[PDB]
From a paper:
Here, we identify ZUFSP as a Ub-specific DUB that selectively cleaves K63-linked polyUb. Human ZUFSP is a modular protein comprising 578 amino acids (aa) with four C2H2 type zinc fingers at the N terminus followed by a conserved motif interacting with Ub (MIU) juxtaposed to the catalytic domain (residues 294–578) at the C terminus. In summary, the UBDs in ZUFSP we have here identified, the ZHA and UBZ, form the distal and the putative proximal Ub binding sites, respectively, to together enable the DUB to selectively cleave K63-linked polyUb.
The asymmetric unit contains one molecule of the complex, with clear discernible electron density for residues 236 to 578 of ZUFSP, and the entire Ub molecule. The second extension created by α1 forms a long helical arm, ZUFSP helical arm (ZHA) that protrudes away from the central domain. The crystal structure reveals that the catalytic triad in ZUFSP is made up of C360, H491, and D512. A conserved Gln Q487 forms the oxyanion hole that stabilizes the carbonyl oxygen atom of the scissile bond. The main hydrophobic interactions are mediated by F260, L263, and Y267, which are all positioned on the same face of the ZHA, and these residues are conserved in evolution. Extensive hydrogen bonding and ionic interactions between R72 and R74 of Ub and D406, Q408, Q412, and E428 stabilize the C terminus of Ub.
Numbering used by the authors:
A (entry chain C): 1 to 75
B (entry chain A): 236 to 578
Write the structure that this text describes.
Amino acid sequence: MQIFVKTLTGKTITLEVEPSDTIENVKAKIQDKEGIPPDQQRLIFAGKQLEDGRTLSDYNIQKESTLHLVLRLRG
Amino acid sequence: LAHQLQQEEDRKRRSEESRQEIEEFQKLQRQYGLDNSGGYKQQQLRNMEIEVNRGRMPPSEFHRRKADMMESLALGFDDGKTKTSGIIEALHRYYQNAATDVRRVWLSSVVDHFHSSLGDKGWGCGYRNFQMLLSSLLQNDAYNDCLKGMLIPCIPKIQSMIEDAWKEGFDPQGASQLNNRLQGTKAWIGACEVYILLTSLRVKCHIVDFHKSTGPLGTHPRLFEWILNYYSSEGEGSPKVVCTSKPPIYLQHQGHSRTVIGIEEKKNRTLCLLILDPGCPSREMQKLLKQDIEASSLKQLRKSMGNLKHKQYQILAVEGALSLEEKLARRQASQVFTAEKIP
Ligand SMILES: [N+]
Ligand SMILES: [N+]
């Protein structure tokens, strides 16, 4: 299925994923298309930061859902 | 008919998804200070207008404060109204004279505390930490040539100065993450921004990335040990309280940053960080100034390993000055932006 990944500047990419994909796997797929190491990424969906070892299944991610992507460590 | 049934459900699902996404994006852009909704000047005025509307501040006084704010912003200088001085000297006195559970304590050099004002409350932390660090460099003769003629900048000036580092060519990927602009925003910043700012001023510094916990129960012993190593000296005749020449350490976790101004080695051999928070109001900081320090107040400054359980910390530490050639080398290196990682 396709999902979208959108940064807080509005930059958007599409990813091909399965529900069984871990959040770790999704961060790898983002690195694959953008070159951003997974340690620099925080993914948020429905108010929650997504945990590496959980699956898209775990969070009800649907086709054409958008995950938001926070980059680096700021505060 | 069948196709229509599928198309309608999909449309409805998509619309709900879109509404949710838009609402979340808005909330996040706003939290991170990237929604372009204005800056420090605006927030100060809005929050002062609340103070008038609530009846807590005379309308004339709003005009005076506004006038003074505008002068400070024109000059680029922090107005000092959130500054508290003398904390290091007060800690030195306390550790020297008071019965403590401490074997040895190392302190950074003189450091002024800055908290957020009405203008930056909620988002100014990283900038306020930069101001604390800079206050220490500005009293240290090693940095006289690189920092000659500088006063503590106001937050809008710090935002300008970061932009200037981006314009020179530092960290273009980091710039793009913040829309290439900081003035007129409430943007959260991190150690990467503080790095390129200091580097652009010819200050030699580096980031160390404690990217996962290294101890039991999610603790970060490596972090504590790195700070001990930074503050401490090899041996000899070192006194119980050592007030070093070293600058404080900028400490970032996700959502907030603070300034580490020293480290205690307890008699039981455990370590405790001494940390200033730009969220602390002046009245709380003042308590450290009294001759005998409350137990709660000292406790507030002291952070043991149990108190630092965020997943990832970064520090930025200052190490001396750069030549122009070393600055240009670091500017080029910042194109593919990396930091030392522990472990
Ligand atoms: N304040
Ligand atoms: N702050």
